[PDB]
Design an enzyme around this catalytic site. Structure first.
Site, PDB file in Angstrom:
ATOM      1  N   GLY B  19      -1.418  -6.013   1.810  1.00  0.00           N
ATOM      2  CA  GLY B  19      -1.595  -6.655   0.514  1.00  0.00           C
ATOM      3  C   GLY B  19      -0.353  -6.479  -0.333  1.00  0.00           C
ATOM      4  O   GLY B  19       0.135  -7.418  -0.963  1.00  0.00           O
ATOM      5  N   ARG B  23       4.674  -2.354   0.687  1.00  0.00           N
ATOM      6  CA  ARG B  23       4.233  -1.837   1.976  1.00  0.00           C
ATOM      7  C   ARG B  23       4.914  -2.575   3.133  1.00  0.00           C
ATOM      8  O   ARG B  23       5.324  -1.948   4.118  1.00  0.00           O
ATOM      9  CB  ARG B  23       2.721  -1.958   2.102  1.00  0.00           C
ATOM     10  CG  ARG B  23       2.020  -0.664   2.435  1.00  0.00           C
ATOM     11  CD  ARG B  23       2.308   0.393   1.375  1.00  0.00           C
ATOM     12  NE  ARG B  23       1.237   1.375   1.128  1.00  0.00           N
ATOM     13  CZ  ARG B  23      -0.025   1.322   1.567  1.00  0.00           C
ATOM     14  NH1 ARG B  23      -0.466   0.325   2.326  1.00  0.00           N
ATOM     15  NH2 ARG B  23      -0.860   2.296   1.238  1.00  0.00           N
ATOM     16  N   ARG B  42       8.371 -14.782  -6.124  1.00  0.00           N
ATOM     17  CA  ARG B  42       7.332 -14.122  -6.899  1.00  0.00           C
ATOM     18  C   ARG B  42       7.164 -12.665  -6.523  1.00  0.00           C
ATOM     19  O   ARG B  42       6.078 -12.126  -6.681  1.00  0.00           O
ATOM     20  CB  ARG B  42       5.993 -14.850  -6.734  1.00  0.00           C
ATOM     21  CG  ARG B  42       6.061 -16.303  -7.149  1.00  0.00           C
ATOM     22  CD  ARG B  42       4.848 -17.060  -6.680  1.00  0.00           C
ATOM     23  NE  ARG B  42       3.912 -17.148  -7.777  1.00  0.00           N
ATOM     24  CZ  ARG B  42       3.688 -18.249  -8.477  1.00  0.00           C
ATOM     25  NH1 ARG B  42       4.330 -19.380  -8.170  1.00  0.00           N
ATOM     26  NH2 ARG B  42       2.810 -18.208  -9.473  1.00  0.00           N
ATOM     27  N   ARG B  86      -4.051  -8.604   9.506  1.00  0.00           N
ATOM     28  CA  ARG B  86      -4.110  -7.904   8.225  1.00  0.00           C
ATOM     29  C   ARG B  86      -4.233  -6.407   8.464  1.00  0.00           C
ATOM     30  O   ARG B  86      -5.008  -5.949   9.313  1.00  0.00           O
ATOM     31  CB  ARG B  86      -5.258  -8.416   7.354  1.00  0.00           C
ATOM     32  CG  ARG B  86      -5.548  -7.552   6.141  1.00  0.00           C
ATOM     33  CD  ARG B  86      -6.420  -8.226   5.095  1.00  0.00           C
ATOM     34  NE  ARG B  86      -7.227  -7.220   4.404  1.00  0.00           N
ATOM     35  CZ  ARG B  86      -6.776  -6.345   3.499  1.00  0.00           C
ATOM     36  NH1 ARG B  86      -5.492  -6.337   3.125  1.00  0.00           N
ATOM     37  NH2 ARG B  86      -7.624  -5.466   2.963  1.00  0.00           N
ATOM     38  N   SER B  89      -6.824  -1.422   3.483  1.00  0.00           N
ATOM     39  CA  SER B  89      -7.713  -0.291   3.387  1.00  0.00           C
ATOM     40  C   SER B  89      -9.038  -0.781   2.824  1.00  0.00           C
ATOM     41  O   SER B  89      -9.115  -1.879   2.274  1.00  0.00           O
ATOM     42  CB  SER B  89      -7.098   0.819   2.541  1.00  0.00           C
ATOM     43  OG  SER B  89      -7.185   0.453   1.189  1.00  0.00           O
ATOM     44  N   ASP B 203     -11.072   4.965   0.089  1.00  0.00           N
ATOM     45  CA  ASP B 203     -12.091   5.790  -0.564  1.00  0.00           C
ATOM     46  C   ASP B 203     -13.384   5.744   0.205  1.00  0.00           C
ATOM     47  O   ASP B 203     -13.653   4.775   0.923  1.00  0.00           O
ATOM     48  CB  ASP B 203     -12.377   5.301  -1.981  1.00  0.00           C
ATOM     49  CG  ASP B 203     -11.240   5.561  -2.920  1.00  0.00           C
ATOM     50  OD1 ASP B 203     -10.979   6.748  -3.211  1.00  0.00           O
ATOM     51  OD2 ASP B 203     -10.612   4.578  -3.372  1.00  0.00           O
ATOM     52  N   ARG B 216      -3.733  10.974   4.456  1.00  0.00           N
ATOM     53  CA  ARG B 216      -3.586   9.577   4.075  1.00  0.00           C
ATOM     54  C   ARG B 216      -2.474   8.906   4.893  1.00  0.00           C
ATOM     55  O   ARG B 216      -2.632   7.785   5.370  1.00  0.00           O
ATOM     56  CB  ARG B 216      -3.274   9.501   2.581  1.00  0.00           C
ATOM     57  CG  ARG B 216      -4.006   8.409   1.821  1.00  0.00           C
ATOM     58  CD  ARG B 216      -4.499   8.888   0.455  1.00  0.00           C
ATOM     59  NE  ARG B 216      -3.437   9.461  -0.381  1.00  0.00           N
ATOM     60  CZ  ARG B 216      -3.372  10.735  -0.772  1.00  0.00           C
ATOM     61  NH1 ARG B 216      -4.315  11.606  -0.421  1.00  0.00           N
ATOM     62  NH2 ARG B 216      -2.358  11.141  -1.521  1.00  0.00           N
TER      63      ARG B 216
END
Lengths: 233, 233, 233, 233, 233, 233
Positions: B19, B23, B42, B86, B89, B203, B216
């Site tokens: 996303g 990343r 953008r 994709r 998370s 989460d 993580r």
């Protein structure tokens, strides 16, 4: 439980389910050792027997989601059933899908609003238990059985008024159309059990291509063997 | 194509898409050989490089289905892209789902009506390409990476007013919630390309359990390795 | 608030929001005095500065309602924001709408069901705060800027499969189509804040008419001046 | 045109429309010069007269969207009408809305699916013509009349079974509830004419506060004066 | 016509249809003269015989609308059938409905969207052919059989997750709930044939009241006699 | 009860209701003994008188479901009314329906979502009280009045944008189209009162066939006589 006249312990934890109760009978006599008829309310026959020394049941579920999920619900809730594998046929809706293919239904969509109602009003996905999906895939490959894995659509009207229905399924990648798969998956998610549909191709909705009875029978046998091997832990 | 300022040949046939464009940048610098920034309209950064001698692209898709499928549509239609994986998370919605698990999204549901609109008004299933799903599963196992395969739900409102949403997902077996997976799958079916979402657990919506930054990071690395190995033919 | 990495007091009570974060940057450098970058998570840049001695923020919101309303929700709830003015562009859907017009969105409709969900399941109107709408109108007139005030439609799919969509908008009087306006208005009503969208015409969906870059730039400047003067109390 | 028994030229280009035909009568006798009754089919009375030397019509529209838009459609299509201003009352749904306020309906939402059907199946915005909205606002201010401009909701059931309806309207900022405004606006957009609803507060749905008959009458007069001045070019 | 293995002329123009094929068998042996089994595909048994010197058929339709309307469609379209009378049972949802009552279904509603799809997307009424409804009523009275005429609801899920369903039916006057009536009526309207459902009370959903087997049997007999006399011209 | 200005006891337990209040007036003067005007708020006239020595009321209900059910609700809840018979006209949508026929509405469907809202969100059937339906049928026969009993559709837009609407009604067996019948039936079920609509044919939507005024008047008289005899216990 006015719909199944078995005793509470009469079913194996897995039930293989064709639509046609006479198909369940045939499977019980042809593939199972020591099959016993355990239910026959409303001519909906079901059996419990052994395959390769393991207990297994096979039972008709009748036609349409309403029929399938009613029986499914009773099996799960009154007969301790933990896994249902549907064995059916579908009308093929892709050119690359062939008359001899066995379809493994990864996921299903539907026009039955019964699934959305199960999943709190949301249009949550309805799919096969992956472990089962993976096992059937693996076995099909080990056995040299031609499979295709993808999406099916279960429609409520066998005689649907929408002439664009089949082309619509084709345009979106759908492998074929049946009546019950989506119901089973929705039921399974809501009830917390495992499920999978394995399907042969009864017609090709794009080509209308025809088959000999022995080609039809080889598909069937493949599907049954696959369903049995997948079921048996 | 006002949204991607690459040249027509600038993308590999597979694009890995987080996303966050930062990343994608990080992945391009850390995992790819000879990555080149090919688009930055953008601030939505995308790269083309090599992994184990094979060409591969990585690009941000931004937040929400509307964002994801706009970029996705351009990649497919103007940049020749044949596969989108994709990497994201999700918020976990099952007790058996753990902070260190990588989720392979077999199928997804959504409250975006954009999928139904793609599939001619019918609520057709939206799922991962099985070959890709199977490959990632296999690799996760070969690599000793902890996976769970099942259903996700992609919701349009990160800040949804329905307080029963999370419990609803739990009751129906759903592994977790994200924003985009369902969009990608719908796009893929409608466009006739391949896709898969691989996701870490950001989460746990049931337990609220916390993680060290190194826990993580191990998830992340696992997901990237898996996405790269799955992508590379 | 994983999406904005500002401090709690870092925003003015009004935030002007284009879709493109690079547009926010440009505005902060070109029109604001002493602009400071306050957020850059995920390349979504936002700034706080002064206009005519008054504090004001400008920040990208990304593409699609899902993106816009997520940022919007965080601004309102964690950063004390009381007013959001969207500055965007739309595809014109009326013959009397011209390339040089600035559109003031009185009200908006959408195919996103996120608004209905905000408003308890009812299809309640989603419109601009009148005081703001009236102020921008007044200023446009005082400044001799060509405006049109009317309805917009925000669609979830930039690449929508409905070929009749544009003609449908024309038949109902709609001034043009964008992606986010309706989201902002729904958010504003549900959250109890003020909002307005001011928009230039990026394309004419009926005529396909073209513009010089200096015509495009005069529109932009007009929109920014208008947004700034409207915002500043 | 079985519902209006006027001659084709019997209406002014603007028609002011209360719900109650006896209200139209009263307005025609009290405010208009030389009003003539032009229609009385089904006791739905309408008049054509002069205000400040300009031609103007006033006619009842009866109760509910179905009633209003039927008459509205006939006026537009058989009687050359180009502008309809509804004068009504609403149940107030905000604490800051007072018994003496005149409401200018910027936009309206509804549970009537008739608007969506007009706008090709899409939930397009339904709002007042801005020039009219702006003019009434201006006049209210010039005249020292207390106004509020915002959103109304038009519900199909005066006696609605949803007990949460009023609280729902309050939570979303809605100024008040009536029966017809949304219908008029939808009709106006679909038919390509101008419209506006001006409304007094007949009840306060939050406070249940009571009024003297002379307070009620001052509201009414204000609304009529405003409607007349807005209408007259 | 893979679902009925009769010859084209094997059915009477009226077919009486219980859900249970074993019920059809029982009726054929107990009430008909010279009944012949004409179909048995999938254990769904059907018969053609004589009642009071007139030709008449009786056949199971299985469970759920999907099942019923599939068989119904085949009968109408391939077997020349002009009238279908469903004989079933329902769960009573009114206090004044008694265990011994025979219900004549004037009209039915449903949660199956199959009816709306038949009737071009509109929610058109689905009701019994009046001549048949009137005849059964008359006969019940001539025979001193206790009837109630009113509305039924046919639900798709025998095991429905909505706990308020039964109370909802009670609040709206509904006589009882079944699975198929609405399907039959929708089919009949769309196909241009005649239909009626006659039903006994299998359970009382409000009182849970119990019956002796001989009370249950008197209901049944009454229903059959009524169905036969209604059918026979 | 701001809509009826009668005293609480001013109505008979049955109210006959045309749409047009001037029709109620005419009926009160022509058919009733000692009719007294009991309500005239908003020109919606209603009367209470005697027919064959029995007390009976007749009142206009105005146009559209919203209008009808508002008045209906007040009658039931504030004026003790136990039965409402609508007398109206419809546009015929079957070839076998003739200009001189009186239609008895067995059941009705609608595009108003007000019925579904009354019946807890479910699309429950909305039909005439059978005893009344049967009585009117019987009387029509005893009197030699030509009747047809079947389904009507009540549409919210007299001027509906769907050009296929009439053909859609024809294809599904519908006798004709009106505006209010479905509303009355829904109201009656939800409120627990009795109802029936008796209707003449004002136009033939298939043939456009014309009538003399004396043919039109014979229909009317028949309908009134029938409504009066049905009402009177």
């Amino acid at each position: 439980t006015a719909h199944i006249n078995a005793q509470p312990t009469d079913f194996a934890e897995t039930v293989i389910m064709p639509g046609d109760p006479l198909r369940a009978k045939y499977i019980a006599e042809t593939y199972l050792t020591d099959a016993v008829e355990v239910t026959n309310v409303r001519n909906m026959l079901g059996y419990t027997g052994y395959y390769q020394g393991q207990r297994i049941s096979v039972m008709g579920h009748g036609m349409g989601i309403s029929s399938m999920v009613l029986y499914g619900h009773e099996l799960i809730n009154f007969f301790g059933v933990k896994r249902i594998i549907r064995i059916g046929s579908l009308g093929a809706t892709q050119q690359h899908v062939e008359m001899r293919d066995v379809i493994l239904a990864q996921a299903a969509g539907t026009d039955s609003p019964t699934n959305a109602k199960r999943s709190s009003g949301y249009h949550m996905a309805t799919s096969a238990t992956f472990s089962l999906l993976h096992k059937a895939y693996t076995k099909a490959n080990e056995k040299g059985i031609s499979v295709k894995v993808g999406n099916v659509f279960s429609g409520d009207l066998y005689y649907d008024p929408d002439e664009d229905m089949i082309p619509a399924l084709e345009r979106f990648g759908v492998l074929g159309i049946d009546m019950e798969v989506a119901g089973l998956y929705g039921l399974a998610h809501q009830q917390g059990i495992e499920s999978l549909a394995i399907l042969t191709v009864s017609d090709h909705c794009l080509t209308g291509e025809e088959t000999t009875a022995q080609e039809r029978q080889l598909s069937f046998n493949n599907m049954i063997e696959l369903a049995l091997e997948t079921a048996l832990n």
